[PDB]
Amino acid sequence: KAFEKKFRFDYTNERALRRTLQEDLVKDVLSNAHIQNELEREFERMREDREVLRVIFPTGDSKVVLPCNLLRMIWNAQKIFHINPRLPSDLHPIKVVEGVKELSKKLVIVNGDDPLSRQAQENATLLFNIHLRSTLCSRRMAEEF
Amino acid sequence: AGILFEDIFDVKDIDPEGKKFDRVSRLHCESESFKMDLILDVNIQIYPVDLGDKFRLVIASTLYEDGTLDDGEYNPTDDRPSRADQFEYVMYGKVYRIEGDETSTEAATRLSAYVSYGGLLMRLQGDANNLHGFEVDSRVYLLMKKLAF
Amino acid sequence: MFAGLQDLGVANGEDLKETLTNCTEPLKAIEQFQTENGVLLPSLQSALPFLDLHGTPRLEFHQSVFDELRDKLLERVSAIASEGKAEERYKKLEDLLEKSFSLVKMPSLQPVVMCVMKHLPKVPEKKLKLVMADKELYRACAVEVKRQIWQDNQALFGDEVSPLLKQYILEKESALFSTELSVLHNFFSPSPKT
Amino acid sequence: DAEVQQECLHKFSTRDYIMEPSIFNTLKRYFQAGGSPENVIQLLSENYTAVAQTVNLLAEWLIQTGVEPVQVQETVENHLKSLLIKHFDPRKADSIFTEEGETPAWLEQMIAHTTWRDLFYKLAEAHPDCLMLNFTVKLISDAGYQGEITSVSTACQQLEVFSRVLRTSLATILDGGEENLEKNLPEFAKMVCHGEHTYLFAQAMMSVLAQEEQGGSAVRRIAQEVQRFAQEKGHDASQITLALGTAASYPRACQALGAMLSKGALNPADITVLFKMFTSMDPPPVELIRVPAFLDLFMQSLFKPGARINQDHKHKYIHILAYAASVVETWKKNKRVSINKDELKSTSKAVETVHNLCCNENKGASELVAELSTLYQCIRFPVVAMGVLKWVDWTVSEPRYFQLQTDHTPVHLALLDEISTCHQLLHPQVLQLLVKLFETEHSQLDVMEQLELKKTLLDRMVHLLSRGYVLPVVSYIRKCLEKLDTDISLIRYFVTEVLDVIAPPYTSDFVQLFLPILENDSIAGTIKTEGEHDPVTEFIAHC
Amino acid sequence: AILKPRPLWTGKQIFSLIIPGHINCIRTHSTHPDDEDSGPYKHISPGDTKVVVENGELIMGILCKKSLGTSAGSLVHISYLEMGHDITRLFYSNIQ
Amino acid sequence: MASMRESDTGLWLHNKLGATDELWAPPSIASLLTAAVIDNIRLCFHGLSSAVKLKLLLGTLHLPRRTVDEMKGALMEIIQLASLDSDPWVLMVADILKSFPDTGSLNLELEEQNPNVQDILGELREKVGECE
């Protein structure tokens, strides 16, 4: 229940959208069905990654070692660009989803287009991709960062 | 002008957890008109206070009445008029956190502004109406003066 | 659509037309029919002006009340099928069935009759025979009524079974004559449980 | 008339058009248009349904099968209510009432039930502009059902009726004792404190009556109950009460107490001010600081575990509490005559020792028992004893305390017995604490320790009964036995010990409350044993 | 940090100049009570624990080996990860 | 601190204090009492409804001591002007509050041609005498 309430980014309530997003964006995310489908697919992939994590990590040890400190980079961006985390921002959630998807392409460990190479590359950056998608979520970028 | 907030406070309590530091004292003060709580760290060695004292607290963005918005560097050779001429204790710091009873649907009725004056912390907790000039990562002057009434 | 109402005294559309044909002032008779013979409740009569005022005629909420009372009756009898003394309540359900067998022919109350027949473990034989005479009443009847019907109906039971036997033969001859000539999938390949 | 006839015929085509409320109007229009009614009759032949008659037929079917007719009527009326709320239009109702111009008898049937009257109240609230709603309200008032109309806020806006209600309620309160005050307090307090003006006037008259030193304690208690109820509702008027009193000569004390009660906390500055003035040669009226809320906050500060207080002002706190509790003053005609300060040194030392014992939660209970002599010596004062009981209340209020409590019959219950013995006024508080302990159903310990704790609590409440606090204890036992929240063995042992310790004769109230206790089979079939001294048989025979 | 009655700076204010660039770091002092983070005064520490650095400025907290030592996430570690190695060398020398 | 005219002052008072649901005077009344409003109430007190009068009079006590000290004469004037209203509630409240700005206390006078007060005091006193 906590996972769903923290990573869903419901597009039903309008007051919360006005509080977190500008008016030019709330109507777009409320009327467009494609955006809602993309958001639902994002949440489903997050749930699959959650299942994969619970399979790989028994005993509930959430401490891991990873290359980039995403939270510290988010904090640095907040301090550099003077976010003022009190007013609604200008960031379409579809922009966040597309940015994460295109970023996942560039971070390559195994170089090649072979299906074997594709699978090896997907495995090598699996944990980092899961962490990145769990950090740069559509809801977190609009409710927490 | 640049007066972010002004009110009269009376020292309702001094540091209740005990004197952690000898030269710095914690003060819990209440308001008179807007009824907002204040927590402040003061240099008790140079500006001694005790229980029951009252003072005027005027949080201001700049010390100059014309609001020329100085950069924030120490230039003692400045002959321009300043608010500090009519205040006994002046501190300069930056606001670093703003809290509130914000809900996911409607706004916040109570705010809590946290400011650090180079180590000495102050928390001003009150209704949201009186705290509107506080924007995080901005410079603030303290400008308190004791009252004899 | 409204046959059998005359038996219990509730006038149907046939007698209503036959009466209004030779009546000069239908208004007063209609009023006395809807008020006296209908819902004799002062609360509903006081409600009528408000419902006129909204512009939604008395038709709609009268139909809603009739449907909700029908639903309440069926749900109450469903609870009745498992509460109270078994034999006494079974006889009460039989009494309700013999009262509603006159109204079984009117579809707005036919579901009540079929529901009562379904709830009653053993429908009277004459009612079963009359239901068997009509196709709609037979098909609408639940599995319990079908079980009670089939016990004494040899030809009807055989005729109902026959299409299933024909379907079994058709699928058996489709399996025996199938192009999937594989060892792992033959006529006897599936386990008996499957 | 082609369009009119065509639209009428199309209307007739709808399923069951005959029972329109304008079918009179529609058929009159059709007759005016010259259309012959045989087409209407032929169309309505297949276009009729008994949506009015067969509803009743199903009703008697349900009645015959065994359903209550009253329930069927209630369901029908509730559905009618709902469909009327969803199908109501006021302006056309005003139009038709202007057309009619008479009082509707169908409106009398409309009002005749309570649910429909509530529907009218809701409609009048929703559509205040409409005329028929005001007309129905005035008809309800004339018919005698003005009481069902909203009167909680109407009572506040009326002076004399509210005054008479207050007078009658207080007279009934003083007639029936505290048992009836507990019953009349909710409604009277809600009526008084729902309106601020009513609260102010009521407090004014209570303060004026309490001016008399003869019997003014009851009036002051009434005023305290009213002000406590007002505070529990989020309305703060403590400064108003201070302004009512003689705090004019001591503005500092009034301001300090007003601030302390407004913020609801204990601050060193105002307490230091009060200590300085009261310890001086001209102390203010002590009765001003005798408000129960301030003393309750003070006990929360110095008794509740986890509460931290300034050690450098703890002596001032103790002195203030001692002066408020133990130091006595003489008043004649509201004039200060003399001050008795005898209970100031030993009392303050006892308060300090008890506070140190209570607020030192790191020390075990064994250490507290080790100083039982001093504990009993200090527990003999009313304020100190009540503070001890409060400290025990918060200390045991933690569910984990019973897990850390390793005695079947602990020392806390012995201190409760001492509290019951020491002062008669503290008996309601001991009873409340015992009820809180017993009603606490535990799902985290073994049932055996719960049974032992309940048996010990039964012993404590037997002790409460012995010291004269009989009626509430007996009533609580009767309620528990009739609620089946107590084990039958517990009830049997309790009643056995009660009848073992007590002796005839017995008052009318005691026997009247105890005869139904034996009337329950759970006692008749258990306690009744073959022996020369059978308590149940003896009590039955003696009555 | 204080202008009247006498201009006095603070150790944290001077140390903010030593911290390079705009470094963001959060640590806890060696004597930080655990229950403090539970109740009120979470962001305003009575004991001056909970080291917080924003924009390369020491907002609050007392520095010890937990934040300047050879531990993961220490101030020197964040300096080396964010800034280069020359800047970190200057940081070491300036502190000393 | 603009000079709010009589009709405008009445509109402002019936908008800020028009909450019939709020039979309790809100603490905001402490900030709703200033020099200009009290001065201009001299003409708009006629048009105020009885609930508005009661709310304002009950809120007049929720003031700082320094504010009462610096705003004495205007408050005496408003008390004497409130003592000429049709509702006896306002009359009695102003009569008792006339001593608030002077000493900080409330006057205590009753049974002065107040039939409800007379009946209440008499019956409660006789009942207390019966159950002393």
Residue numbers in the entry:
A (entry chain A): 914 to 1058
B (entry chain H): 2 to 150
C (entry chain V): 1 to 194
D (entry chain W): 40 to 582
E (entry chain A): 578 to 673
F (entry chain U): 1 to 132
Sentences from the paper on this structure:
NELF is a large, metazoan-specific protein complex consisting of four subunits, NELF-A, NELF-B, NELF-C/D, and NELF-E. It binds both RNAPII and the nascent RNA transcript emerging from RNAPII and inhibits transcription. DSIF, a conserved heterodimer complex of Suppressor of Ty 4 (SPT4) and SPT5, is required for NELF recruitment and RNAPII pausing and also serves as a processivity factor upon the pause release by NELF dissociation. In the present study, we determined the cryo-EM structures of mammalian ECs containing RNAPII, NELF, DSIF, and/or TFIIS stalled on a nucleosomal DNA.
The major classes contained RNAPII with its catalytic site translocated either 1 or 3 bp downstream from the initial position, and we built models for the 3-bp translocated complexes (AEC1-nuc and AEC2-nuc). In contrast, AEC2-nuc revealed a different NELF binding mode (mode 2). In mode 2, the NELF-AC lobe is farther away from the secondary channel, exposing the TFIIS-binding site. This change causes a ~35-Å shift of the N-terminal α helix of NELF-E (α1), the only resolved part of the NELF-E subunit, which forms direct contacts between the α1 helix and the downstream DNA backbone. The AEC2-nuc structure revealed the direct contact of the N-terminal α1 helix of NELF-E with the downstream DNA. In AEC2-nuc, RNAPII does not reach the downstream nucleosome, but the NELF-BE lobe is close to the nucleosome. Thus, the NELF-binding mode 2 is involved in RNAPII pausing/stalling, where the downstream DNA contacts by the NELF-E basic helix play a critical role.
